Design an enzyme around this catalytic site. Structure first.
Site, PDB file in Angstrom:
ATOM      1  N   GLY D  56      -2.408   3.184  -2.352  1.00 27.50           N
ATOM      2  CA  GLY D  56      -1.759   1.941  -2.003  1.00 27.50           C
ATOM      3  C   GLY D  56      -1.455   1.142  -3.262  1.00 27.50           C
ATOM      4  CB  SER D  85      -2.435   7.574  -4.861  1.00 25.84           C
ATOM      5  OG  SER D  85      -1.693   6.572  -5.502  1.00 25.84           O
ATOM      6  CG  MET D  86      -5.713   2.076  -5.606  1.00 26.38           C
ATOM      7  SD  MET D  86      -6.426   1.935  -7.253  1.00 26.38           S
ATOM      8  CE  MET D  86      -5.018   2.166  -8.272  1.00 26.38           C
ATOM      9  CG  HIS D 110       0.545  10.570  -7.479  1.00 28.87           C
ATOM     10  ND1 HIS D 110       1.334  10.793  -6.369  1.00 28.87           N
ATOM     11  CD2 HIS D 110       0.005   9.339  -7.315  1.00 28.87           C
ATOM     12  CE1 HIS D 110       1.283   9.738  -5.574  1.00 28.87           C
ATOM     13  NE2 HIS D 110       0.490   8.843  -6.127  1.00 28.87           N
ATOM     14  CG  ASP D 159       2.169  14.257  -5.375  1.00 23.74           C
ATOM     15  OD1 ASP D 159       2.403  13.212  -6.039  1.00 23.74           O
ATOM     16  OD2 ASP D 159       2.458  14.400  -4.164  1.00 23.74           O
TER      17      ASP D 159
HETATM   18  B1  LIG Z   1      -0.728   5.484  -5.310  1.00 26.80           B
HETATM   19  O1  LIG Z   1       0.270   6.290  -4.799  1.00 26.80           O
HETATM   20  O2  LIG Z   1      -1.453   4.780  -4.396  1.00 26.80           O
HETATM   21  C1  LIG Z   1      -0.519   4.691  -6.694  1.00 26.80           C
HETATM   22  C2  LIG Z   1      -1.804   4.442  -7.493  1.00 26.80           C
HETATM   23  C3  LIG Z   1      -2.145   5.445  -8.608  1.00 26.80           C
HETATM   24  C4  LIG Z   1      -1.082   5.756  -9.654  1.00 26.80           C
HETATM   25  C5  LIG Z   1      -3.450   4.985  -9.256  1.00 26.80           C
HETATM   26  N1  LIG Z   1       0.118   3.418  -6.329  1.00 26.80           N
HETATM   27  C6  LIG Z   1       1.398   3.132  -6.598  1.00 26.80           C
HETATM   28  O3  LIG Z   1       2.099   3.836  -7.269  1.00 26.80           O
HETATM   29  C7  LIG Z   1       1.944   1.827  -6.058  1.00 26.80           C
HETATM   30  C8  LIG Z   1       2.901   2.178  -4.886  1.00 26.80           C
HETATM   31  C9  LIG Z   1       3.246   0.977  -4.050  1.00 26.80           C
HETATM   32  C10 LIG Z   1       4.484   0.342  -4.215  1.00 26.80           C
HETATM   33  C11 LIG Z   1       4.818  -0.772  -3.452  1.00 26.80           C
HETATM   34  C12 LIG Z   1       3.920  -1.273  -2.508  1.00 26.80           C
HETATM   35  C13 LIG Z   1       2.684  -0.651  -2.334  1.00 26.80           C
HETATM   36  C14 LIG Z   1       2.353   0.466  -3.102  1.00 26.80           C
HETATM   37  N2  LIG Z   1       2.589   1.115  -7.155  1.00 26.80           N
HETATM   38  C15 LIG Z   1       2.227  -0.124  -7.531  1.00 26.80           C
HETATM   39  O4  LIG Z   1       1.337  -0.751  -6.991  1.00 26.80           O
HETATM   40  C16 LIG Z   1       3.019  -0.706  -8.682  1.00 26.80           C
HETATM   41  C17 LIG Z   1       4.382  -0.455  -8.796  1.00 26.80           C
HETATM   42  N3  LIG Z   1       5.104  -0.958  -9.803  1.00 26.80           N
HETATM   43  C18 LIG Z   1       4.467  -1.706 -10.712  1.00 26.80           C
HETATM   44  C19 LIG Z   1       3.103  -1.959 -10.602  1.00 26.80           C
HETATM   45  N4  LIG Z   1       2.394  -1.471  -9.588  1.00 26.80           N
END
Ligand SMILES: *[B]([O])([O])[C]([C][C]([C])[C])[N]C(=O)[C]([C]C1=[C][C]=[C][C]=[C]1)[N]C(=O)C1=[C]N=[C][C]=N1
Ligand SMILES: *[B]([O])([O])[C]([C][C]([C])[C])[N]C(=O)[C]([C]C1=[C][C]=[C][C]=[C]1)[N]C(=O)C1=[C]N=[C][C]=N1
Ligand SMILES: *[B]([O])([O])[C]([C][C]([C])[C])[N]C(=O)[C]([C]C1=[C][C]=[C][C]=[C]1)[N]C(=O)C1=[C]N=[C][C]=N1
Ligand SMILES: *[B]([O])([O])[C]([C][C]([C])[C])[N]C(=O)[C]([C]C1=[C][C]=[C][C]=[C]1)[N]C(=O)C1=[C]N=[C][C]=N1
Ligand SMILES: *[B]([O])([O])[C]([C][C]([C])[C])[N]C(=O)[C]([C]C1=[C][C]=[C][C]=[C]1)[N]C(=O)C1=[C]N=[C][C]=N1
Ligand SMILES: *[B]([O])([O])[C]([C][C]([C])[C])[N]C(=O)[C]([C]C1=[C][C]=[C][C]=[C]1)[N]C(=O)C1=[C]N=[C][C]=N1
Ligand SMILES: *[B]([O])([O])[C]([C][C]([C])[C])[N]C(=O)[C]([C]C1=[C][C]=[C][C]=[C]1)[N]C(=O)C1=[C]N=[C][C]=N1
Ligand SMILES: *[B]([O])([O])[C]([C][C]([C])[C])[N]C(=O)[C]([C]C1=[C][C]=[C][C]=[C]1)[N]C(=O)C1=[C]N=[C][C]=N1
Ligand SMILES: *[B]([O])([O])[C]([C][C]([C])[C])[N]C(=O)[C]([C]C1=[C][C]=[C][C]=[C]1)[N]C(=O)C1=[C]N=[C][C]=N1
Lengths: 178, 182, 179, 180, 179, 180, 182, 181, 179
Positions: D56, D85-86, D110, D159
């Site tokens: 998320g 992911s997160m 990823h 991924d």
């Molecule tokens: B994952 O897929 O949960 C990932 C976390 C990982 C890389 C540690 N999260 C994201 O890539 C999120 C996706 C998202 C976008 C929009 C709403 C909710 C979730 N990205 C971000 O939170 C993000 C995107 N751009 C800038 C900063 N943070």
């Protein structure tokens, strides 16, 4: 529709067919046909058939003023139904040359519209539609012989007329018999 | 949303004669505010009531249900603008007990004329236009009484959206004091 | 969501308010009511306002801002996650010396956004209003950070993302909260 | 949804927090509030954070991450189902030695995802921000796993699915929890 | 929906868990929490898991599967209505000797389903993941049923519907529960 | 929405106050009728207070309320706040004679019923006769309740007719403007 | 649209140097009107052109494409209002050759200030507001030149929708004559 | 829509070496305008071409198909702004033959920086950002060459929407002359 | 669209084909039909294929590619605007020595995109197909550019934007056409 299309073939004989709601596109076409027919011959009558539920008041007045402006007499012939701005245009034909077929219907009523926004804007819109109704009533009075007061009362609600009643009212001159 | 030891937070504030108006004003909101005002008067007809206002406005008749209830009951209703009091919200702010109408320093007040619509026959549009014009005359007369400004000045100043700071709202007569920190 | 009270009601008993959403009139109404309730319970003890918010309505934010400044208790502000737009403005509004961010929390500042539709006269009124609103935000942020109004204007022309350490250097918070 | 308390409130009484959804601001606010509450009840006893999450919001995840590191109690993390992911970042954020996955649980890592729209200047600002965010995540994950940042960068370009045993080899968890 | 407790909470007091929906992360979170709660109350007494499910997410199903195997109590599984896809996998995961189906219950097994979109490289990653997930499911089902992995693979190539009696012959359950 | 445990409306009902503050449909009428019946059963003599802020609504739903007001033993006072339009102004006029009020800035609007009809000519005729008989029924009662002639009521309801509270008193729709 | 012995009706009128502007004004309509004006000048740089106008208005820049082409070409362009000339339509009506601007007796003319929108950052809203205000000043200056009314009066008379009869449009200076029946 | 006899009105003007751009610029519009420019050079390689421009702008690569074709062919392409030339429309106005770039007196010109979008992984957003930044540099370098303004000034003057009158566009160097009656 | 021929029909008389859209089956069948027609008119004279395309279907592009290689006339390719994806593949497919781009034209190369949905077995089939399709594209692009298959694979892993000068350096075109 059958292909000239059939309407283009009738226009060659100075016949214009109004068979739809009146909007700016329809009015521009009818006006262009009237000017063309005048340019072809400024003496010969033009025949305008009307089967229409009405439409825009300003679009209707583009046609109305062009009918009155050009040199040829424009006969008006109601088939089916002439309602609202359609019945106004039916009454606009050359005096003595306004007709309806025996089972044709005529309907007269007051203008409709809408207004949205500030109280000041609603007042402007109401004053405009009230002035537009006064303009329509004044002209209908001139074209029918009825008083403006009678036109006002008789258009307060939808008022459906037979062809015979439209002649009696002064909206047409004759019921066209076979 | 939270609960206090059981009340929700707004029910807890109502126990202390505080009413929070924090939404658009519609019949549902007005029904609730009127009921709270009548309830508080029945509990104690002498103690002040505090009406916080953060509202973009809403229905004129719903606002008048609240306005008339404020004037009918015996308790003084203090009005306190936080955030924004716009349109019927600023009308209700100005309707608080004289001397007890407040805004916090960065709260905004906006006044303008009523808005509406009308559709149908010319005679129906005329009826609707006459009704909204009379409603504006009624609102201006009351705002003139509550602010000290002439009706003619109110009419001029509400022709378009008119944003006032808290200090300007005090100068105008919509509130009595800008509430400074305690 | 869980029950103990729901979890937020349980924290409110300990004078903790969680601002964890976009700021609209409903959110501001709830936060202001909680602040007023806490002051009525005890006008001397600190209040703790946690902030994880993308921002929201400027007037809704000022309802919260002015209530923070009006009440007697110090309101500590603690940024977790992100304080963007009106969220970072409220972060900077905490009691001086008591504005915090956790080490990986993000802070974002930018100029207000809005819309205008209608006649040229109406667009002009809307533009003048949003411009006056920006001047108001900038003057207050200048007072709360120690940065000049001119620097705040430049630094908010576009989205400006700050780390917690950069937010402390900027004057938006007083300390990065270490474990 | 069952009542005993609802079932989650009942587990919270025993210092167990269940993360079983996407991570957004509402979920993070709730988890942070549960963590703060559990520390206030007892600052010495362990907390148990079960994780079944597709991931998320990064900032929402960091609200949880920073709260885990801030509070006094050890927070054990236990992956059931999938930590992606997160979610896998939070799994690795548990107390060192107390990060677990069940034998058939999956872990996926990823790079962050996002979007940008508007003027070239605005797209650049958004690109710089998500790139700095990726650098921040990779740096912390390198610290928590013992892997180099260069390897983290390579291994998250697309991924990357890991079994529980692979997640232990990677350093994302400490032990695969075998049946008691 | 009726109250006695709601009806399901009342059954949980007697160590009965009802799985009567598709399996997603929310359902698995609830089932897992109920299993952990029941073990904490009494680690020796059996648990009864009724299953009427069309299946659902494989990872959510494995959250439940691994919790059943982890905890000390035997978890009896009882299929009513239908146990399809991940539902029949969980039916087969009950304590050996304590997996049941009612006489007219249906069981269906088949291979995993999914989707992939994007660049060729991404589609390849997604295909490898779902194939590896299928191998994992087949290996465990083979252990749970006594059938070879090769037979499981053939028998799940398309939807394969089994009566309760056939599920017993297959090794998915131990007994057809008679009145 | 607030609570006093009573919600605010239940708390007012304890004092024989009923709030009609929405459009009138079968659900609203069912609730109002039930409150009137409950109040009569509690005390068959004491007055009931019905506050009205309503844009109107269904004629038959309004008549469920109307007939219940006239049936029960207690007098029902009606108090218009905000606006009583259409079936709302009909119910305002239906309160006990001498106990029908409007606040000074409350508005009253009267007009004829609205409806629709679709289908065969025979079906349209049935629907038209029904709405005309419904209008005659409303006008006859309003004439009795106001003292105005039926002919004046028909004239004054042909289109939307807005009245101030003082005009509503002069008309006979209310007995008094409630002053502070 | 009927066909004439083969022309559609509008192409037949164009042969006699008549252009029909009978819709809202956007870039496509302006492209067509401009191309017809340029073609007619190329056919004969001395003979008058007749532009019939029945239009609710439309884009200001599209209207100025037509306006500047009318002023650039050598032939006089007569303008004839039928039905309604509103907004940018009444502006183009006033742009016809002086002495050759007409309306039929029941045609309507409406004038008002420009409308638009702005969305985004405060600095972007300011840019859009400045642009629409500068556009209004430009329209008012030209309309002042074309009608003989002061800029101040035009500004006042276009603050809200202002509907004019053909006779009032003549008195205002938007047209030179009301065309009476032939 | 009208016909001249049989040509539609635009085909009839093309016979006199006039091209009408009166829309947003997309690949379809560019394909048509490029084809007309190639056809006119084939019909006569010496005579000027006249390109009327009333356009809100559009795709940068579609605009560059037009731009490169104007520079490639032998005839001088006169550009005439009527109405508005915004964004890629003002870039094309500035691309006409030097001394033969015109605007009518009430025509508006607007310049600004390119717009776009990017979605996906951080690495993909970086690729998209780098591409639109390089595209902006390319547009600014060419606009500098064609207006005589420095790249630094072009950058500053296109950070936000920048509206110019015809007279301001001439002073800027986007056009050579305001066409008077 | 300009008409008496439309403009494209007039250019086709001079053996010029204008590709100015996405490549789908409708576009490919039109282009193939034009190539076959031109060969029948004169099998010796060159054909000119202008390309401004964001790409499109791989099989539709191979209909055009194979027709170019099958007919006797040399097909010159000229990139104007952008040749992306299958558009840049077709640009590189022109007669060797007769592949051009205008100075500000852009070229973009990347790997194929697609989707797959259904059973694991179906996803595997779809993944194998798009992977084999990528191998086919890379092998041909290697032959037409002189670059190794390994370099093509690396350089198409993500969107790779090239200037006209870079596309000549890469071997996708032979010359940048100067005025
Ligand atoms: B994952 O897929 O949960 C990932 C976390 C990982 C890389 C540690 N999260 C994201 O890539 C999120 C996706 C998202 C976008 C929009 C709403 C909710 C979730 N990205 C971000 O939170 C993000 C995107 N751009 C800038 C900063 N943070
Ligand atoms: B009728 O129903 O055709 C009537 C004409 C008249 C002689 C009674 N026309 C209208 O009432 C039209 C309706 C309409 C509204 C909107 C779009 C199209 C048609 N009214 C007007 O044209 C009108 C409305 N308000 C003000 C002025 N004119
Ligand atoms: B405002 O914007 O809050 C304003 C109050 C002010 C002028 C004292 N209210 C209105 O103008 C409302 C807008 C509205 C319309 C429809 C539904 C809800 C709100 N107007 C009215 O209530 C109204 C409109 N027409 C006639 C009478 N009252
Ligand atoms: B932010 O992004 O939260 C920002 C606050 C910051 C600059 C201190 N808020 C706004 O820009 C909001 C955006 C918004 C628009 C519409 C609904 C909700 C939120 N703008 C305003 O509140 C606003 C205020 N006055 C005028 C215009 N816009
Ligand atoms: B079944 O139909 O329930 C099956 C389980 C198995 C025992 C054969 N589940 C799936 O095939 C699911 C479908 C699905 C449901 C909900 C969300 C997403 C997908 N597939 C997966 O869980 C999955 C796992 N890995 C990769 C792709 N899909
Ligand atoms: B009013 O607008 O509230 C009015 C009541 C009356 C006292 C003047 N009510 C109606 O006119 C309703 C409108 C309505 C239509 C459909 C559903 C709900 C409400 N009319 C009727 O209830 C009706 C209509 N036709 C026949 C009988 N009753
Ligand atoms: B009118 O209503 O036609 C008017 C012209 C003027 C002479 C009074 N036109 C406009 O107000 C248009 C409205 C419009 C908006 C958007 C698309 C099309 C038409 N305005 C503009 O063209 C405009 C708006 N903002 C800035 C500049 N120009
Ligand atoms: B303008 O607003 O016309 C501008 C041109 C330039 C001279 C400043 N056009 C663009 O910025 C276009 C807008 C657009 C986006 C998407 C589809 C169509 C048009 N941008 C691009 O062409 C673009 C965007 N990202 C990367 C490269 N090019
Ligand atoms: B490109 O974007 O034009 C690219 C060609 C390149 C690698 C030389 N084309 C594709 O990737 C297309 C995308 C597409 C998908 C769906 C509909 C239309 C176009 N892919 C395919 O054609 C394709 C081929 N085989 C398998 C899957 N997808």
């Amino acid at each position: 529709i059958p292909t000239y299309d059939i309407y283009s073939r009738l226009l060659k004989d100075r016949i214009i067919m109004l068979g739809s709601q009146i909007d700016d596109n329809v009015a521009n076409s009818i006006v262009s046909q009237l000017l063309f027919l005048q340019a072809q011959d400024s003496e010969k009558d033009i025949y305008l058939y009307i089967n229409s539920p009405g439409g825009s008041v300003t679009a209707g007045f583009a046609i109305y003023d062009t009918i009155q402006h050009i040199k040829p007499d424009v006969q008006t012939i109601c088939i089916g139904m002439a309602a609202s701005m359609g019945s106004f245009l039916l009454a606009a034909g050359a005096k003595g040359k306004r007709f309806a077929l025996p089972n044709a219907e005529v309907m007269i009523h007051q203008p409709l519209g809408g207004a949205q926004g500030q109280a000041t804007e609603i007042e402007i819109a109401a004053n405009h539609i009230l002035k537009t109704r006064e303009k329509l009533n004044r002209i209908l009075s001139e074209r029918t012989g009825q008083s403006i007061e009678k036109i006002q009362q008789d258009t307060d609600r939808d008022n459906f007329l037979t062809a015979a009643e439209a002649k009696e009212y002064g909206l047409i001159d004759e019921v066209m018999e076979p």
